[PDB]
Design a protein around this motif. Structure first.
Motif, PDB file in Angstrom:
ATOM      1  N   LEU A  30       0.659  -0.818   0.627  1.00  0.00           N
ATOM      2  CA  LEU A  30       0.397   0.029  -0.383  1.00  0.00           C
ATOM      3  C   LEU A  30       0.771   1.467  -0.122  1.00  0.00           C
ATOM      4  O   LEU A  30       1.929   1.378   0.615  1.00  0.00           O
ATOM      5  CB  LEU A  30      -1.387   0.268   1.064  1.00  0.00           C
ATOM      6  N   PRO A  32       2.757   4.894  -2.170  1.00  0.00           N
ATOM      7  CA  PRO A  32       3.469   5.237  -3.057  1.00  0.00           C
ATOM      8  C   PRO A  32       5.376   3.929  -2.617  1.00  0.00           C
ATOM      9  O   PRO A  32       5.832   3.803  -3.609  1.00  0.00           O
ATOM     10  CB  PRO A  32       3.872   6.440  -2.776  1.00  0.00           C
ATOM     11  N   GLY A  52      -1.590  -4.166  -5.927  1.00  0.00           N
ATOM     12  CA  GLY A  52      -2.356  -5.593  -4.467  1.00  0.00           C
ATOM     13  C   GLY A  52      -3.094  -6.087  -5.056  1.00  0.00           C
ATOM     14  O   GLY A  52      -3.577  -6.875  -4.411  1.00  0.00           O
ATOM     15  N   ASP A  86     -10.933   1.184  -7.922  1.00  0.00           N
ATOM     16  CA  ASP A  86      -8.955   1.871  -7.221  1.00  0.00           C
ATOM     17  C   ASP A  86      -9.725   1.476  -6.282  1.00  0.00           C
ATOM     18  O   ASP A  86     -10.492   0.574  -5.375  1.00  0.00           O
ATOM     19  CB  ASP A  86      -8.774   2.808  -7.409  1.00  0.00           C
ATOM     20  N   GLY A  87      -8.790   1.174  -5.195  1.00  0.00           N
ATOM     21  CA  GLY A  87      -8.736   1.546  -3.605  1.00  0.00           C
ATOM     22  C   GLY A  87      -8.968   0.169  -3.424  1.00  0.00           C
ATOM     23  O   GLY A  87      -9.917  -0.737  -2.062  1.00  0.00           O
ATOM     24  N   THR A  89      -6.344  -2.120  -1.911  1.00  0.00           N
ATOM     25  CA  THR A  89      -5.686  -2.092  -0.399  1.00  0.00           C
ATOM     26  C   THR A  89      -5.713  -1.411   0.114  1.00  0.00           C
ATOM     27  O   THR A  89      -5.900  -2.294   1.696  1.00  0.00           O
ATOM     28  CB  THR A  89      -3.686  -2.319  -0.699  1.00  0.00           C
ATOM     29  N   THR A  90      -6.766  -0.792  -0.144  1.00  0.00           N
ATOM     30  CA  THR A  90      -7.297   0.749   1.361  1.00  0.00           C
ATOM     31  C   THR A  90      -8.382  -0.208   1.623  1.00  0.00           C
ATOM     32  O   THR A  90      -8.560  -0.988   2.851  1.00  0.00           O
ATOM     33  CB  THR A  90      -7.318   1.570   0.705  1.00  0.00           C
ATOM     34  N   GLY A 413      -5.607  12.739  -0.074  1.00  0.00           N
ATOM     35  CA  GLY A 413      -5.899  11.474   0.187  1.00  0.00           C
ATOM     36  C   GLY A 413      -5.007  11.485   0.928  1.00  0.00           C
ATOM     37  O   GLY A 413      -4.707  12.262   2.553  1.00  0.00           O
ATOM     38  N   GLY A 414      -4.022  10.023   0.346  1.00  0.00           N
ATOM     39  CA  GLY A 414      -2.859  10.315   1.915  1.00  0.00           C
ATOM     40  C   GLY A 414      -3.616   8.511   3.258  1.00  0.00           C
ATOM     41  O   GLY A 414      -3.076   8.969   4.261  1.00  0.00           O
ATOM     42  N   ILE A 453       0.705   3.379   5.422  1.00  0.00           N
ATOM     43  CA  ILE A 453       1.151   4.105   4.884  1.00  0.00           C
ATOM     44  C   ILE A 453       2.304   3.993   5.164  1.00  0.00           C
ATOM     45  O   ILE A 453       3.384   4.324   4.985  1.00  0.00           O
ATOM     46  CB  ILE A 453       0.292   5.130   3.875  1.00  0.00           C
ATOM     47  N   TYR A 477       0.584  13.662   6.083  1.00  0.00           N
ATOM     48  CA  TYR A 477       2.008  13.360   5.844  1.00  0.00           C
ATOM     49  C   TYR A 477       2.003  13.368   3.809  1.00  0.00           C
ATOM     50  O   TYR A 477       0.802  12.458   3.083  1.00  0.00           O
ATOM     51  CB  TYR A 477       1.686  12.419   6.753  1.00  0.00           C
ATOM     52  N   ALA A 479       3.751  10.948   1.644  1.00  0.00           N
ATOM     53  CA  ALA A 479       4.386   9.235   1.726  1.00  0.00           C
ATOM     54  C   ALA A 479       5.830   9.506   0.616  1.00  0.00           C
ATOM     55  O   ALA A 479       7.238   8.911   1.306  1.00  0.00           O
ATOM     56  CB  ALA A 479       3.752   8.227   1.181  1.00  0.00           C
ATOM     57  N   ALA A 480       6.009  10.702  -0.339  1.00  0.00           N
ATOM     58  CA  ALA A 480       6.834  10.352  -1.038  1.00  0.00           C
ATOM     59  C   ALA A 480       8.322  11.288  -0.685  1.00  0.00           C
ATOM     60  O   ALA A 480       9.199  10.903  -0.684  1.00  0.00           O
ATOM     61  CB  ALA A 480       6.088  10.935  -2.287  1.00  0.00           C
ATOM     62  N   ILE A 492      -1.973  15.314  -3.609  1.00  0.00           N
ATOM     63  CA  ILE A 492      -2.309  14.149  -3.299  1.00  0.00           C
ATOM     64  C   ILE A 492      -3.383  13.914  -3.053  1.00  0.00           C
ATOM     65  O   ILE A 492      -4.074  14.700  -2.087  1.00  0.00           O
ATOM     66  CB  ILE A 492      -1.446  13.618  -1.869  1.00  0.00           C
ATOM     67  N   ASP A 494      -7.738  12.304  -3.751  1.00  0.00           N
ATOM     68  CA  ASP A 494      -8.368  10.644  -3.843  1.00  0.00           C
ATOM     69  C   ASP A 494      -9.415  10.468  -3.929  1.00  0.00           C
ATOM     70  O   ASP A 494      -9.986  11.735  -3.184  1.00  0.00           O
ATOM     71  CB  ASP A 494      -8.065   9.531  -2.849  1.00  0.00           C
TER      72      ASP A 494
HETATM   73  N1  LIG Z   1       2.938   9.866  -2.070  1.00  0.00           N
HETATM   74  C1  LIG Z   1       2.058   9.817  -1.600  1.00  0.00           C
HETATM   75  N2  LIG Z   1       1.807  10.588  -0.637  1.00  0.00           N
HETATM   76  C2  LIG Z   1       0.460   9.645   0.459  1.00  0.00           C
HETATM   77  N3  LIG Z   1      -0.672   9.419   0.126  1.00  0.00           N
HETATM   78  C3  LIG Z   1      -0.438   8.722  -1.271  1.00  0.00           C
HETATM   79  C4  LIG Z   1       0.108   8.703  -2.282  1.00  0.00           C
HETATM   80  N4  LIG Z   1       0.017   8.796  -3.746  1.00  0.00           N
HETATM   81  C5  LIG Z   1      -1.015   8.503  -3.318  1.00  0.00           C
HETATM   82  N5  LIG Z   1      -1.752   8.240  -1.917  1.00  0.00           N
HETATM   83  C6  LIG Z   1      -2.752   7.842  -1.470  1.00  0.00           C
HETATM   84  O1  LIG Z   1      -2.731   6.200  -1.501  1.00  0.00           O
HETATM   85  C7  LIG Z   1      -4.090   5.716  -1.646  1.00  0.00           C
HETATM   86  C8  LIG Z   1      -4.465   4.798  -2.739  1.00  0.00           C
HETATM   87  O2  LIG Z   1      -3.252   3.752  -2.166  1.00  0.00           O
HETATM   88  P1  LIG Z   1      -2.469   2.696  -2.744  1.00  0.00           P
HETATM   89  O3  LIG Z   1      -1.834   1.796  -2.909  1.00  0.00           O
HETATM   90  O4  LIG Z   1      -1.401   4.384  -3.103  1.00  0.00           O
HETATM   91  O5  LIG Z   1      -3.005   3.870  -4.550  1.00  0.00           O
HETATM   92  P2  LIG Z   1      -3.422   2.866  -5.730  1.00  0.00           P
HETATM   93  O6  LIG Z   1      -4.205   2.840  -7.233  1.00  0.00           O
HETATM   94  O7  LIG Z   1      -5.059   3.576  -4.735  1.00  0.00           O
HETATM   95  O8  LIG Z   1      -3.244   0.975  -4.795  1.00  0.00           O
HETATM   96  P3  LIG Z   1      -4.750   0.453  -4.385  1.00  0.00           P
HETATM   97  O9  LIG Z   1      -4.741  -1.172  -4.639  1.00  0.00           O
HETATM   98  O10 LIG Z   1      -5.987   0.454  -5.449  1.00  0.00           O
HETATM   99  S1  LIG Z   1      -4.554   1.117  -2.357  1.00  0.00           S
HETATM  100  C9  LIG Z   1      -4.811   7.291  -1.656  1.00  0.00           C
HETATM  101  O11 LIG Z   1      -5.949   8.044  -1.179  1.00  0.00           O
HETATM  102  C10 LIG Z   1      -4.210   8.676  -2.869  1.00  0.00           C
HETATM  103  O12 LIG Z   1      -4.477   9.552  -2.188  1.00  0.00           O
END
Ligand SMILES: Nc1ncnc2c1ncn2[C@@H]1O[C@H](COP(=O)(O)OP(=O)(O)OP(O)(O)=S)[C@@H](O)[C@H]1O
Ligand SMILES: Nc1ncnc2c1ncn2[C@@H]1O[C@H](COP(=O)(O)OP(=O)(O)OP(O)(O)=S)[C@@H](O)[C@H]1O
Ligand SMILES: Nc1ncnc2c1ncn2[C@@H]1O[C@H](COP(=O)(O)OP(=O)(O)OP(O)(O)=S)[C@@H](O)[C@H]1O
Lengths: 525, 525, 525
Positions: A30, A32, A52, A86-87, A89-90, A413-414, A453, A477, A479-480, A492, A494
């Protein structure tokens, strides 16, 4: 055969072990800073993937009980992935948190049903609170920004999505394929989109995508139940003579026809795909007529008296392309004459005018919308084919994220959206002690994504989570860069829809798991 | 089926064991004093080889986790081999050193992501440092010297490759064949080269070389995908009547076509190998027209209206011999009349003149370059057939090394280039303690090749490494003569490209492997 | 020897298993419908008892950790018994309930220290609530009633104790002996009362009573710490010549002195016991002088200059009988002339008059109180010796219960006192969720005694507990007659000091055991 039955707390601990294994495997990736996960391949080198979805897909466990617990969590997470695109692993992290805490409480002698009620109250309150936190993403500027952010910070793809949304409309259709030139281009041609999935997974000619691509196929139209294989032998012979791919629109396809079509596709002599008829009833017939106008085809219905046996290649429709998503379809550039399309649009427009029923009028309005707006097509532009495929995938996922944001909105997001709504709902109380405990379980489980994260980043999750909670608004926060700041300012973002769907589905599966005692399965053999 | 999941430090130790086994097996054979390695032959006596590629190829362990780790390292090493030509064992030695040190540091609680970042920074600085240390190899004298050194100190092959490079050009096409007389010969004829690989490994009629040779074959020029076997059944009848092998160039072939061609080749009635079309879109068609003009063939395209069924032997192209490398193709002396060849060259020249886009003009320029320069043919000349084979192999590997040196450059070999780069970058520092540790890990792992070479020689690796580090410039250890001296004076030279590729790919696999926790694999059964 | 250390949740589960075993074994015998428990006798038939103390005394488990848990619970229950006299099984039941619920909560992830704080707050509120619910028992009618109820519904003993306590006083001292005649006899004679226990358990000549009985013994009186055995050899020879048991009043004795006294008692030549000197300091000296006046003895002190070696039989004091207790002492009818007793009483009275310090005046007042009130002697009267013993035991336990009720009060028994207190404190809340949970654990554990009594009766405990909670005041369930009613009317009465001590000690052990992480022991050997 015989079936081992395990009921009581031992069933619960088996389920907990399974969800723990799956959640660990999938949550490691989960964010970046997601750590790589290497999956074993039967032949050749193993794959490496931070995605994920893949690692969740490749998880099955040896012992039946925790295996099916993991399968439940995997199924609901995949449902969440299908809802918003999307989302995943969240959703699985939220699941694991809620199941872990709720099962601990159940072992603590609490009433499972009251815990379910408390968690449901907490999650619905959090959902409406998120809807309060949502920031509209209607302007093309935020559309470009979210498209850029989704596709690994690429501005060109965001610009393309913005132009496509401006051209085809807010709720139009967008498709993407490869382009000959190095330069991206945009065009709009009459098309289609109706939400129907493939009859069987075996029609997928490109499993990595999960859909099909028939370049210049025929398309069949039938309002008749597929009963016998003898009904479509003449068309199969005609298409084999044509050496050209084929599609089928039918009211429904029987299992014998499923076996026959799967066998034919494995043989490879005919590349035939079938999909459920869209709509329902007379609306279904009207939209089948619309498709016939699009593709120059003809609807073959028993009531009319025509039969599938008496079908000539001229009677068949045509299009220059078609793609069937797992639960949607899209034909592009129907051969049918545009004047006929305009006449049909006008006819359905007068049908709207004379319409008195509200929902029938809505159906007619969406019919004219999909019949007039058509589809906007994107062609990706660069030098080599590897970048064709990677940029096409980037465009696909950015388009998914952008449309998800357009539908509902976009929140910081994040994992700080969940933190903020949790802090907002700190005073929520139920009808007794158990409901309060369930509500608190949900609230403390909604902090799981940010903590995970941060843990992937390597920092102390508790410190960062406490600091984020201390701040207000969108302070969060990064993460990158490992730096705090206004999450919206640093881009950032979502889509509200993805977080809402992940949270709701995690709550649903967790409540469904909390209130389970018996678990029947085959004997270990 | 059920899948055992191992995540955490146990995954890391399993993968470390696997890479340790593979690295020992393949590193024992590094350098001139490489110790022999013996491998099974299912029937007959075992084979003996100091070739790192074979021993790496035949390694795959019994327990799944370490087996798949060894597979990762083997795959990246083979990728380095494909990129450069040699340096496989150097790449595996670097990978083993970096993996060992990085995992030892990760066990010490250091952050894996920061370690990967530090290693990446160190290797990027190392790559630009190698480019700084690079010595141009444009003079024919150094070309002959490197050809001699690569081919076990044979001056004749160096002379031959020097003459061929002078005759055709710096970035021309070079090919090696078998000659009648004892005297070596050289002749240059119109030819072809585009970068595409075979569809299936089963087309390989000579597994030990990795390609196929077709004496006087037909070639079928196509533009569309392969949908049915029926499209080229008359072609198969014609080529069976001709009793002479055939090749297929087309946009793409599908799974059933691959199965059909594999079955036909196993039958041996028709010797057919297919390859993906070059270019993309309009320029794909342009170079297909170039191929038509070379071989006297004809482009077959559905858009034009032509079909593969109505294919006559006259329409087929021809060449006097064809060789398809694993990722490249070459046709020599297309039967097509030369007049049309310079006509097409002139046409594409005026296309260059009218060209305004820079990259399209680059494609046109390389098209005229490959259409006018042709191919070089260097038939080896000796007495007996055994020396025919070995000298042909020597010419092949010397050609690979010489072209690799021409592309980028040439630095002092024997592992001294990495030693000098590491000594130069001794002051590099990252953003924190973890990145510093990663950088130091990379730097101390750069000394692995020289240490391993010295250990194979039987001397004390630390003593020789310290002595080499004490010196400056190209002062290094000559393993063959076991005496120090300027590594370039005695000609021990390594292309900059091979060392750069080995280092970069070792760093990449190390970064991927350090940041791995989960490892799913089938149960041991 | 080495030591096995078990810390964490495994420690808690081991202790829980141990206390569960002990609590089941001892709680089966709670209430009037207590089920019999059979113990094992090394020689002869097994003993059968419904007495909680007897069954608890004989339980120690084979596993070390379970044994430590059981021993902790048994220690605190025996302490509760020592405090009041009756309520051992109630204390163990409360301890088991609180332990089970609290450790379940600790497994639920709640903070142990906050749980202990909540339980302590709840039990303090409960104790003051009991004091609120307490009914005074000053009237002789309720005194006779409680004496009757304690002694298996015997009115004669209630009458006897009422008359005795009227004769001596509310806070007097009561003693019971055996009478020659069948008629009950009562008389009051000058005596003593100081609270000190035997130095070693081996001095007990009647283990089933836990005390010593010395008929017409000599009493030694010393203010000097015992040093050597030679100091009391002459008195030992004198008492051996006298053929009569001896008791020793000394400041203290050491290991060798008590070891030699134990050896002598085992020999049986001299039946000597020893008890620590009462009080402290000049008060100790003054009431040692009082004892000398009582028994005609003399205080032997180093400061005076007199030694124990120089000790004549005339210097020794006398009484007509003496009984030691685990933590109490009494001597009856000292030979000392009553005129000297009156003179000493008057002297200490003028000391009270001149006293200015309040606490010294309190000691002087209690000194004159014990020196004037004396002791009560109740000779039980029946025909045969078996009923002599059983009626003496009934008098003893009824006296204990009656004095306990007099000290503090009397509350509706049958376990409804705690039910009413818990219902009253239903609204009590702590400082956070954990303290609230601890308070609720204590409150729901207060219902354990009534539930256990009902379960022993065989009825549904939940139904009876709900019915009792529904009622108010002293409404409750009569176990003996299996019908509801008013406890005070039906005579089911428990001292407010016997329930308070059980509750407090159960809460204390529960808090002390909930917050236990580590737990060391010896290896199983
Ligand atoms: N650089 C970052 N720093 C912090 N949060 C981030 C960053 N990039 C993405 N996110 C958040 O990560 C969440 C989604 O989870 P990620 O695994 O990073 O991306 P993803 O494409 O959704 O992958 P999954 O497996 O579908 S959750 C969202 O709430 C994004 O805002
Ligand atoms: N006489 C020599 N003294 C010292 N180093 C040498 C000498 N000859 C060759 N080398 C070095 O030894 C290495 C040759 O390694 P090889 O055993 O050929 O395996 P590799 O080149 O790493 O990869 P492949 O695929 O096996 S050729 C290169 O680094 C050469 O520069
Ligand atoms: N007729 C009765 N109906 C209901 N409860 C009763 C009745 N008689 C006595 N009790 C209760 O039963 C309990 C007596 O417990 P016991 O079995 O004597 O053990 P204990 O008194 O807790 O401690 P010990 O040392 O064994 S006396 C007290 O709570 C009494 O109030």
């Amino acid at each position: 055969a015989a079936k081992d039955v395990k009921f009581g707390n031992d069933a619960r601990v088996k389920m907990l072990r399974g969800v723990n294994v799956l959640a660990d495997a999938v949550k490691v990736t989960l964010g970046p800073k997601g750590r790589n996960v290497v999956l074993d391949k039967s032949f050749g080198a193993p794959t490496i993937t931070k995605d994920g979805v893949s690692v969740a897909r490749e998880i099955e466990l040896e012992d039946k009980f925790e295996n099916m617990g993991a399968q439940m969590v995997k199924e609901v997470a995949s449902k969440a992935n299908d809802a918003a695109g999307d989302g995943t692993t969240t959703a699985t992290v939220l699941a694991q948190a809620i199941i872990t805490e709720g099962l601990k409480a159940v072992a603590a002698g609490m009433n499972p049903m009251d815990l379910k009620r408390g968690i449901d109250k907490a999650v619905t309150a959090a959902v409406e609170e998120l809807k309060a936190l949502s920031v509209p993403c209607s302007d093309s500027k935020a559309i470009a920004q979210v498209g850029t952010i989704s596709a690994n910070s690429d501005e060109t793809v965001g610009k393309l999505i913005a132009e496509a949304m401006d051209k085809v409309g807010k709720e139009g259709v967008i498709t993407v394929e490869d382009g000959t030139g190095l330069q991206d281009e945009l065009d709009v041609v009459e098309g289609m989109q109706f939400d129907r999935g493939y009859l069987s997974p075996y029609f997928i000619n490109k499993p990595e995508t999960g859909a099909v691509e028939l370049e210049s196929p025929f398309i069949l139209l039938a309002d008749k139940k597929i009963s016998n294989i003898r009904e479509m032998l003449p068309v199969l012979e005609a298409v084999a003579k044509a050496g050209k791919p084929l599609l089928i629109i039918a009211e429904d396809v029987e299992g014998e026809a499923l076996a026959t079509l799967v066998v034919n596709t494995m043989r490879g002599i005919v590349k035939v795909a079938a999909v459920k008829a869209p709509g329902f009833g007379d609306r279904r017939k009207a939209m089948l007529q619309d498709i016939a106008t699009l593709t120059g085809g003809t609807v073959i219905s028993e009531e009319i008296g025509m039969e599938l046996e008496k079908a000539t290649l001229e009677d068949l429709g045509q299009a220059k392309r078609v793609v069937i998503n797992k639960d949607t379809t899209t034909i592009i550039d129907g051969v049918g004459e545009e004047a006929a399309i305009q006449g049909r649009v006008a006819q359905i427009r007068q049908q709207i005018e004379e319409a008195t029923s509200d929902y029938d009028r809505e159906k007619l309005q969406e019919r004219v919308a999909k019949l007039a707006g058509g589809v906007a097509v994107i062609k990706v532009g660069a030098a080599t084919e590897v970048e064709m495929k990677e940029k096409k995938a980037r465009v696909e996922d950015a388009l998914h994220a952008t449309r998800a944001a357009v539908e509902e909105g976009v929140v910081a997001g994040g994992g700080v959206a969940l933190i903020r709504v949790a802090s907002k709902l700190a005073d929520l109380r139920g009808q007794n002690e158990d409901q309060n405990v369930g509500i608190k379980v949900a609230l403390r489980a909604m902090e799981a994504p940010l903590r995970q994260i941060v843990l992937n980043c390597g920092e102390e999750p508790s410190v960062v989570a406490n600091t984020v909670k201390g701040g207000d608004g969108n302070y969060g926060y990064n993460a990158a860069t490992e730096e705090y700041g206004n999450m919206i300012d640093m881009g950032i973002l979502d889509p509200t829809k993805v977080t809402r769907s992940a949270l709701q589905y995690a709550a649903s599966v967790a409540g469904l798991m909390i209130t389970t005692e018996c678990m029947v399965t085959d004997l270990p053999k």
